[PDB]
RNA sequence: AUCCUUAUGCACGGGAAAUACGCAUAUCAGUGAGGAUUCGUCCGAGAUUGUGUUUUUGCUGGUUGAA
């Protein structure tokens, strides 16, 4: 009686606090190139405007 | 702390080319694009279509003429 034979326990499964390591999203070479092209282009444009 | 590898970002410098370099509310693409081959197999990343410039873009200097 003091420990019941009848019941089956389903105790709370303790979830471990997994540290969210934000994933290093990489770039394709092409993507990188595009980025380089665009930022640089923008800079150039700015220079032109700020020199014209 | 010193030395080195990789990638990238910024730049000195040097070189080549622009028939080249993009762009896309496109279509498809390592769940295979496109290729090789001694035929056993092998390489493996763009291809298609559309389109913008492309004997050139942006800026300077000179002589000159113009008169």
């Amino acid at each position: 009686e003091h420990p019941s034979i009848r019941y089956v326990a389903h105790p709370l499964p303790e979830k471990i606090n997994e540290a969210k390591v934000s994933i290093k999203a990489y770039l394709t070479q092409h993507e990188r190139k595009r980025l380089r092209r665009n930022r640089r282009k923008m800079a150039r444009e700015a220079r032109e405007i700020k020199i014209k």
Side-chain angles (χ1 to χ4, degrees), chain A residues 5-7 9 11 13-14 25 40 45-47:
Chain A
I5 292 175
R6 298 167 96 79
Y7 305 125
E14 191 61 30
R40 285 184 70 77
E45 282 179 0
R47 281 198 262 89

Side-chain angles (χ1 to χ4, degrees), chain A residues 26-36:
Chain A
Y26 308 85
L27 298 169
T28 60
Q29 195 168 31
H30 268 123
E31 276 161 352
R32 296 165 192 276
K33 198 225 294 183
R34 194 174 283 94
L35 253 61
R36 193 177 157 277

Side-chain angles (χ1 to χ4, degrees), chain A residues 16-17 19-30:
Chain A
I16 299 163
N17 295 5
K20 282 194 170 188
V21 176
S22 52
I23 299 161
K24 283 155 155 188
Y26 308 85
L27 298 169
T28 60
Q29 195 168 31
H30 268 123

